């Protein structure tokens, strides 16, 4: 019965991730479809639950047509990849100021996606051409605590690591605030 938003810059793997979870098939192998806005039910702590997921665009031209669905939501979350910190810079400033403007007191855990690549040498090689890549969990925990959030979670697209826990603490934010 739970509502839950997925903010974030475009191509922070928002859709790429949720597609891979609700349908168990490993990322990049997700059987693709249109529609968008996904959901499925998960076993947490002890009880089972139905968890709902609203997809949001980071594509700029869909502002003003985004906030109208934030009504009714019971847990929020903001998605940034630890890949491009241009998303990390743009999430303190675009999405916390957006949460204060609609449902400003419902928990919104900010989460880091695409952890897998933080040890990939061929991407640190493209990262060193512009000399930026790491987004460290010390800074991650601190950006989210200073963003008054509840938890930051280093999650990964593939390798499955970091995952599961996120949707779990999404509802674990609701049960035990």
């Amino acid at each position: 019965a739970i509502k839950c938003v997925v903010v974030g810059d475009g191509a922070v793997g928002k859709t790429c991730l949720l597609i891979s979870y609700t349908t168990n098939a490993f990322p990049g192998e997700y059987i693709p479809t249109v529609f968008d806005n996904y959901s499925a039910n998960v076993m947490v702590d002890g009880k089972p639950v139905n968890l709902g997921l609203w997809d949001t665009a980071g594509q700029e031209d869909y502002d003003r047509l985004r906030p109208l669905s934030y009504p009714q939501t019971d847990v929020f979350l903001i998605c940034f990849s630890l890949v491009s910190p241009a998303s990390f810079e743009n999430v303190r400033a675009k999405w916390y100021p957006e949460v204060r403007h609609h449902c400003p007191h419902t928990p919104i855990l900010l989460v880091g996606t695409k952890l897998d690549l933080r040890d990939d040498k061929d991407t640190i090689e493209r990262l060193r051409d512009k000399k930026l890549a790491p987004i460290t969990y010390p800074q991650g925990l601190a950006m989210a605590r200073e963003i008054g959030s509840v938890k930051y979670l280093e999650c990964s697209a593939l390798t499955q690591r970091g995952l599961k826990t996120v949707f779990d603490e999404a509802i674990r934010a609701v049960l035990c605030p």
Binding site: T33, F35, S39, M43, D55, T56, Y62
Partner: protein, 412 residues
């Protein structure tokens, strides 16, 4: 496995299955063990009442697998079985197993016990009426695993298997679990998840690393069986084939160039069985090109919305989402990308008709219900959410317009 030895296997397998939440299978263990002694006592001619081991083929076909000690032992084993079903949330088969019990009590004439034997069958069907089709019962999430590697794995050096994991164990759990269980028995690093889904066999794996294909699967049935397997229990009881849709899109992966492959695999012995795992054997593939899947997958999101309305509950949260997937597409293709590619006047000249004709009736039924859906979302919106739904029908009304231009036809 001899009479004396094949019996001892089932027992300690029951208490072991009992010990660690493998209920249904421990339950199945006892009624499968109790058939084994039914023939051995038939094989000495000590005497469906007393008819060898096929009388337990009623509850499961794999009861045959046990044929290759006295009467009160035969009834103490079903008695122990029936309770194991009572905890395994499988209230139904308890009727098909109290038959040979009654068939002997009616032979020794006891009545009181036959009375409270017929009572606990009523005490089950009653608990069913508030369980069945409430989605309270759940076992589910059978997985398709395969080991690959010679000079690595001993007995299971390659066979393709089908695990029955329990409750809501997703793949994040079982994958990390097999990886971890086998990564530390042959050194780290060299334990590749091999997430593939494709019927791998080329073994272009540089044999210094060991692979473990995993791919979620679903109890698969046809059109005539789907009338028979109506509720949530009936689909898990005795399943031959599970199917998984595997994408084989041209080149990498992700409207017109995207294709998927249904590969069904059977399971030899029928679920539920004694041992948790059981092997696959064949993966027959029905390939669906980007129009056949368009017909079938755009049909998929049609019946689903229609299935949230016949429901009595209808939870304000679960509706508004799926219609946003239906009317207000964002960060995805959109339901209209199907129209422009396989329905526009310029398109749909080499695709056969009747195909495209069925795509019409699915398209309309997907509309006339889509509109029925927005009205219900108006029944439990309440307060602020009303300003929102005012946009939902807007996106929907516009969706009708564009559908009319691609199709050269009026859309109401």
């Amino acid at each position: 496995s001899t009479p004396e030895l094949r019996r001892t296997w089932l027992e300690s397998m029951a208490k072991i299955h009992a010990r660690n939440g493998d209920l249904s299978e421990a339950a199945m263990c006892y009624i499968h063990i109790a058939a084994l002694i039914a023939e051995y006592l038939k094989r000495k001619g000590y005497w469906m009442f007393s008819m060898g081991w096929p009388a337990f083929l009623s509850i499961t076909p794999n009861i045959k697998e046990e044929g290759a000690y006295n009467e009160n032992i035969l009834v103490e084993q079903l008695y122990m079985c029936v309770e194991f079903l009572w905890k395994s949330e499988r209230y139904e088969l308890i009727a098909d197993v109290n038959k040979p019990i009654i068939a002997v009590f009616e032979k020794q004439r006891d009545f009181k016990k036959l009375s409270d034997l017929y009572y606990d069958i009523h005490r089950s069907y009653l608990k069913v009426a508030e369980v069945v089709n409430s989605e309270k019962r759940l076992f589910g999430r059978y997985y398709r695993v395969a080991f690959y590697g010679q000079g690595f794995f001993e007995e299971e050096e390659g066979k393709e298997y089908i695990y029955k994991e329990p409750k809501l164990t997703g793949l994040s759990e079982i994958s990390q679990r097999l990886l971890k269980l086998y990564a530390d028995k042959f050194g780290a690093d060299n334990v590749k998840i091999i997430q593939d889904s494709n019927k791998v066999n080329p073994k272009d794996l540089d044999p210094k690393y060991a692979y473990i294909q995993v791919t979620y699967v679903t109890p698969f049935f046809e059109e005539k069986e789907i009338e028979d397997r109506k509720t949530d229990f009936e689909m898990h009881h005795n399943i031959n084939r599970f199917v998984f849709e595997t994408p084989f899109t041209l080149s990498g992966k992700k409207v017109a160039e995207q294709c998927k492959r249904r590969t069904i695999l059977t399971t030899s012995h029928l679920f539920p069985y004694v041992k948790k795992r059981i092997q696959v054997i064949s993966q027959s593939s029905t390939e669906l090109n980007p129009i056949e899947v368009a017909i079938d997958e755009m049909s998929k999101k049609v019946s689903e919305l229609n299935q949230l309305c016949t429901m009595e509950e209808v939870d304000m949260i679960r509706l508004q989402l799926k219609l946003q997937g239906s009317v207000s597409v964002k960060v995805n293709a959109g339901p209209m990308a199907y129209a422009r590619a396989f329905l526009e006047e310029t398109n749909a000249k080499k695709y056969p008709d009747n195909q495209v004709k069925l795509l019409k009736e699915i398209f309309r039924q997907f509309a006339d219900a889509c509109g029925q859906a927005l009205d219900v979302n108006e029944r439990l919106i309440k307060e602020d959410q009303l300003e929102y739904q005012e946009e939902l029908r807007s996106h929907y009304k516009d969706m009708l317009s564009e559908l009319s231009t691609v199709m050269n036809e009026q859309i109401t």
